[PDB]
């Protein structure tokens, strides 16, 4: 039930634009197209093709008013490199997202079917940087930027995803349980200070982006395979970084090193990353 009175009065008008009427959505529950900890995702028809995420695997949703607020905030986000929210359908509520034909970025670059060039791979990086530039300008911290968490549409447009109501753990292997807090953390993508404090910032998103660039240039290799979970802090503090992939241009590796600056405030902004990477991208043919 929608309690319009419970919402921030500023946001009441926006409800009509986020709520999908049950008769407008057909969801094809017979084939799962994605699996998250909080729920499965299915093909949907809205006639536009969409992805429908269930949240029924969680014991409880929480405050319905908060859920709508989350949806309303997320729907106002509009950028070609950021996954949009189509709306919410109240059957546990269903999250309705544009269908991303080529799935997550990590699986796409690991796929022997497609053959992206070095230029294509850098371009995927550039698109992610533009999405993050948008998100950072909205003061939004992603917290879980990784190749597994970005997706590609039918025209290979890369979109930063896995945020707002779409937030989940879509690949359980890369999340470790913290001793004191219990939080499940993507430790191999996290900035040194975040591992120490569990505080996430746009500058820790920049660190994660550096790892994402490394993923692209290795075509989806796992980072730090010979490191075990939380021993990553010890490993990094020894004076170590991910090595330069064979086909990674030198200036792109320099960008990665800047993203992993020990001082958070010294890391490049996403705007600077867009500029620097667009330059490097332009030097390639094909």
Ligand X SMILES: COc1cnc2c(NCc3nnc4ccc(-c5cc(C)ns5)nn34)ccnc2c1
Alpha-helical runs (H) found in 19-112: 64-75, 105-110
88 binds ligand X (CB under 6 A): no
259 binds ligand X (CB under 6 A): no
| Span interacting with ligand X, options 99-107, 173-181, 184-192, 272-280, rule CB under 6 A | 99-107
| Binding residue count for ligand X, defined by CB under 6 A | 21
**Residues in contact with 41: Cβ distance below 8 Å, sequence separation at least 6, in sequence order:** 32, 33, 34, 35, 51, 52, 53, 54
220 binds ligand X (CB under 6 A): no
161 binds ligand X (CB under 6 A): yes
* Between 50 and 248, CB nearer to ligand X: 50
97 binds ligand X (CB under 6 A): yes
Region 100-159 residues binding ligand X, contact defined as CB under 6 A: 100-101, 103-104, 107, 148-149, 151
Q: Is 226 a catalytic residue?
A: no
Which of 162, 200, 217, 267 touches ligand X (CB under 6 A)? 162
Which of 18, 25, 46, 53 touches ligand X (CB under 6 A)? 53
Find the largest Cα–Cα distance for the chain. Answer: 58
CB 181 to ligand X: min, Å: 24
81 binds ligand X (CB under 6 A): no
CA distance 258 to 268: 7
| Cα Rg of the chain, angstroms | 19
Q: Smallest Cα–Cα separation from 72: which of 141, 142, 10?
A: 10
Place of tokens 């949240």: 55
Pick the catalytic residue: 144, 162, 168, 205? 144
Q: What share of the chain is helix, strand, coil (3-state, %, to 5)?
A: 40, 15, 45
CA distance 267 to 212: 15
| Span interacting with ligand X, options 9-17, 161-169, 197-205, 215-223, rule CB under 6 A | 161-169
Backbone angles phi, psi at 143, to 5 degrees: 80, -20
- Residues with catalytic roles: 144
Which positions touch ligand X (CB under 6 A)? 33-34, 41, 51, 53, 83, 97, 99-101, 103-104, 107, 148-149, 151, 161-162, 166, 170-171
């Amino acid at each position: 039930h929608i309690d319009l009175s419970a919402l921030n009065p500023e946001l009441v008008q926006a409800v009509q634009h986020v709520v999908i009427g049950p008769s407008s959505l057909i969801v094809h529950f017979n084939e799962v197209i994605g699996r998250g900890h909080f729920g499965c995702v299915y093909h949907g028809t809205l006639k536009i093709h969409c992805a429908v995420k269930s949240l029924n695997r969680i014991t409880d949703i929480g405050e319905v008013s908060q859920f709508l607020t989350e949806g309303i905030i997320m729907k106002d986000f509009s950028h070609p490199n950021v996954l949009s929210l189509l709306g919410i359908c109240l059957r546990s509520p269903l999250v309705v997202l544009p269908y991303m034909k080529h799935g997550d970025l990590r699986n796409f670059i690991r796929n022997e079917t497609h053959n992206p060039t070095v230029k294509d791979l850098i371009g995927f990086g550039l698109q992610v940087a533009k999405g993050m530039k948008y998100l950072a300008s909205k003061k939004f911290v992603h917290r879980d930027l990784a190749a597994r968490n970005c997706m590609l549409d039918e025209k290979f447009t890369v979109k930063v995803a896995d945020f707002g109501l779409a937030r989940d753990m879509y690949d359980k292997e890369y999340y470790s349980v913290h001793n004191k807090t219990g939080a499940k953390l993507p430790v191999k993508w996290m900035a040194l200070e975040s591992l120490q404090t569990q505080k996430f910032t746009t500058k820790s998103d920049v660190w994660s982006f550096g790892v994402l660039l490394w993923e692209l240039m290795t075509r989806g290799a796992p980072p730090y395979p010979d490191v075990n979970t939380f021993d990553i802090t010890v490993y990094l503090l020894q004076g170590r970084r991910l090595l330069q992939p064979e086909y990674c241009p030198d200036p792109l590796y320099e960008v990665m090193l800047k993203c992993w600056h020990p001082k958070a405030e010294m890391r490049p902004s996403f705007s600077e990353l867009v500029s620097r990477i667009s330059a490097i991208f332009s030097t390639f043919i094909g």
